[PDB]
Ligand binder design. Structure first.
Ligand SMILES: O=C(O)c1ccc(-c2cc3cccnc3c(-c3cccc([N+](=O)[O-])c3)n2)cc1
Ligand SMILES: [Mg+2]
Ligand SMILES: [Mg+2]
Ligand SMILES: [Zn+2]
Length: 335
């Protein structure tokens, strides 16, 4: 049955199953998953990932409760937002799922840490309005005041992600112990807050420290016996998943760029219509898409992935290669 198999009822079962053969691959096409799942990419991908990792059984989560929660979570992502909709969330969850399976990190993380990372990815952008934290701050949002202008949306995504668990038959963590729930909550909070782009540098600095003090075993697997080191790697992994668009196939990457640019232009028109000063990248009349992608990669995405590649060398070399190739392509497209 469709639901028991994919967590969603679809008229394209055979096609959805073919796409899902790439569940553990960096090359999975989430756009197609969406197209063969009646546009339920997040519910479908989260169900597939959990079945793949046997998380439902391990954590005594009924398929029904999980599907109910996932469908609700997905319903809370805006479909009228060009980039920060459920497709992006599904993509980050799937990317994180692949990153957790990096050979160099084999048997490094606990099952609870794995659960927390994938869950964090799924809820990391829930109810995103399509405008930045600065826009919320500049317009004196009640949300901004509430979180003292720090990680405004990130704190909101967390509040929503957790609150939905209180919905009818939505508590997927009902059977965890008080200790497991406390641990998971703290780790998820840590990983979602880590997606706050303004924290980029604090994260990368920690990651370099992890590379510098790197320790591997005979097999070649990294050594991270202490949570204090592991949570720094997990925060950076979800951050890398969040900034993984430029590392995917050019075809996927180009679609991601078109979407984020549309969202930027949306905010630009909002600011414009409110006599506000248009934010950088948000002016559709002066935006330089290609040059901006090159800057994005050179200053932010590459520095991060290069360090990540060093940490798990050589598992992420092809990802770095792809990033570099995509960078040069957009560079050649600058008029
Ligand atoms: O405030 C946030 O939470 C936030 C802000 C920007 C992005 C983002 C995503 C991109 C995806 C694909 C290509 N580009 C993306 C960019 C981006 C695009 C053009 C330029 C830059 N940049 O940093 O200069 C970044 N930004 C995500 C999240
Ligand atoms: Mg975000
Ligand atoms: Mg909303
Ligand atoms: Zn995100």
């Amino acid at each position: 049955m469709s639901i028991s198999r994919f967590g969603v009822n679809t008229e394209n079962e055979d096609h959805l199953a073919k796409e899902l053969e790439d569940l553990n691959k960096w090359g999975l096409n989430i756009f197609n998953v969406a197209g063969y799942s009646h546009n339920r990419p997040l519910t479908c991908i989260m169900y597939a990932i959990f079945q793949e990792r046997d998380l439902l059984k391990t954590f005594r989560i009924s398929s029904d409760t999980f599907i109910t929660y996932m469908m609700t979570l997905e319903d809370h992502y805006h479909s009228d937002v060009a980039y920060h909709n459920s497709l992006h969330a599904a993509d980050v969850a799937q990317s994180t799922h692949v990153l957790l399976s990096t050979p160099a990190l084999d048997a490094v993380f606990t099952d609870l840490e794995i659960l927390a990372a994938i869950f964090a990815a799924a809820i990391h952008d829930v109810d995103h309005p399509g405008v930045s934290n600065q826009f919320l701050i500049n317009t004196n949002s009640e949300l901004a005041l509430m979180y003292n202008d720090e990680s405004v949306l990130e704190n909101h995504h967390l509040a929503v992600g957790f609150k939905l668990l209180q919905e009818e038959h939505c508590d997927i963590f009902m059977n965890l112990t008080k200790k497991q729930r406390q641990t998971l909550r703290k780790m998820v909070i840590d990983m979602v807050l880590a997606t706050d782009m303004s924290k980029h540098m604090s994260l990368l600095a920690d990651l370099k420290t992890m590379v510098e003090t790197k320790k591997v075993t005979s097999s070649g697997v990294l050594l991270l016996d202490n949570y204090t080191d592991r949570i720094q790697v997990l925060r950076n992994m979800v951050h890398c998943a969040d900034l993984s668009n430029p590392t995917k196939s050019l075809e996927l990457y180009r679609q991601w760029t078109d979407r984020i640019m549309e969202e930027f232009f949306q905010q630009g028109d909002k600011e414009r219509e409110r006599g506000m000063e248009i934010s950088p990248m948000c002016d559709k009349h002066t935006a330089s898409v290609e040059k901006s992608q090159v800057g994005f990669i050179d200053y932010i995405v590459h520095p991060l992935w290069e360090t990540w590649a060093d940490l798990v060398q050589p598992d992420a070399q092809d990802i770095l290669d792809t990033l570099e190739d995509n960078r040069n392509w957009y560079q050649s497209m600058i008029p």
